[PDB]
């Protein structure tokens, strides 16, 4: 007997009840996934369509077939991905890393040393300190590069080594 004047208790209320069922068949409805923007040339961790991993992303030139999503070179390591929105091939490179070593002339003589990062390009060192050198063995901080050549004192690598005069 609904009327415009019946107080809150007697008002007509529309009711909708949602029930969720999880039969063994694969799920067909899920909430929005949401996404962010894309960055490049930076060591970040990514979650491309459920494939997660860390590294740095660059633009590549491989030619995927119209149905692949990602590629791996050998030993099952992913190298390339396809972004689900722009549909272009991106290349993944592991973020740089390597050991560090210290060259010293001995505590007996002095206490100034040099630092060598093994297999690391002289682009992301950190900090700065003194003059920095790039060699086939890595990057070196704290020694001066000369043009002469003497007997080898402390073998560094790639046919080069250091001595004490400064280092």
């Amino acid at each position: 007997g609904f009327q415009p004047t019946n107080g809150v208790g007697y008002q007509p209320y529309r009711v909708v009840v949602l029930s969720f069922e999880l039969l063994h068949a694969p799920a067909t409805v899920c909430g929005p996934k949401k996404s962010t923007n894309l960055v490049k040339n930076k060591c970040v961790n990514f979650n491309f369509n459920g494939l997660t991993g860390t590294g740095v992303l660059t633009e590549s030139n491989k030619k995927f077939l119209p149905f692949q999503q990602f590629g791996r070179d050998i030993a099952d390591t992913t190298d390339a991905v396809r972004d689900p929105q722009t549909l272009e091939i991106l290349d993944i490179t592991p973020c740089s890393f390597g050991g560090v070593s210290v060259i010293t002339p001995g505590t007996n003589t002095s206490n100034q040393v040099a630092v060598l990062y093994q297999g690391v390009n002289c682009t992301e060192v950190p900090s700065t300190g003194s003059n920095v050198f790039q060699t086939r063995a890595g990057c070196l901080i704290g020694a001066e590069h000369v043009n002469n050549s003497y007997e080898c004192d402390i073998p560094i690598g790639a046919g080069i080594c250091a001595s004490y005069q400064s280092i």
Partner: protein, 236 residues
């Protein structure tokens, strides 16, 4: 228009040789100039593939279907267990504009046939669950692979321009993935549909078994050659 025509017209159930046909991409991974070994359900090389030229054939656990054809008399396929409304059934049909896939409890006529005067094969349709419409699938050779696993129905397809007279050629071509459908169903038998006008066609059927294969990927990621491990000692 649920009528019947005949029991047989030619009845040539015969056998022939598969050669090296029935290879499909196992996943969506890109590989360049490599050799990869994978274990999955394949059609063995030099198998014994059945040729017809129309009963309810069994499905087992995967089907390879081939047809050399012109004017595409073959229309679609039907899948299910009891082929009635007491259980879910799958139907795939094609016309000149779109391919249609339905998952419902039909009442198929004992001798399905379409004609034109997209119904007449099912006397009833109810409790429909899944519907899908897309671009049509279809002298020319049509190759399809149907698989069903984990509530997922997978269809791979390929088209080939050929001019060989009688049987499958001595070639090699991989089958690209086409369709995946997320439906839970228990397909065990299947049937073929022909829209032959009011007035019986050659097609080949083979089955799949689990085994290991070796595949060669070229620089562009296309499969160019394959080896069946368990064929002969040289292959091993």
């Amino acid at each position: 228009q649920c009528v019947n025509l005949r029991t047989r017209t030619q009845l040539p159930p015969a056998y022939t040789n598969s050669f090296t046909r029935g290879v499909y991409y196992p996943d969506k991974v890109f590989r360049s100039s490599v050799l990869h070994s994978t274990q999955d359900l394949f059609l063995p090389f030099f198998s014994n593939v059945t040729w017809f030229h129309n009963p309810v054939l069994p499905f087992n656990d995967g089907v390879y279907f081939a047809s050399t054809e012109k004017s595409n008399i073959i229309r679609g396929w039907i899948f299910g267990t009891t082929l009635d409304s007491k259980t879910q059934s799958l139907l795939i049909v094609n016309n000149a504009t779109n391919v249609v896939i339905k998952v419902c409890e039909f009442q198929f006529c004992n001798d399905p046939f379409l004609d034109v005067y997209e119904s007449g094969v099912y006397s009833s349709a109810n409790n429909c669950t899944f519907e899908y419409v897309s671009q049509p699938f279809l002298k020319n050779l049509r190759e399809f692979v149907f698989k069903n696993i984990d509530g997922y129905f997978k269809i791979y397809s390929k088209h080939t321009p050929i001019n060989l007279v009688r049987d499958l050629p001595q070639g090699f071509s991989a089958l690209e993935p086409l369709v995946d459908l997320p439906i839970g169903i228990n397909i065990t038998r299947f049937q073929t549909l022909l829209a032959l006008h009011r007035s019986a066609a050659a097609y080949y059927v083979g089955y799949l078994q689990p085994r290991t294969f070796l595949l060669k990927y070229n620089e562009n990621g296309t499969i160019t050659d394959a080896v069946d491990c368990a064929l002969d000692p040289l292959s091993e």
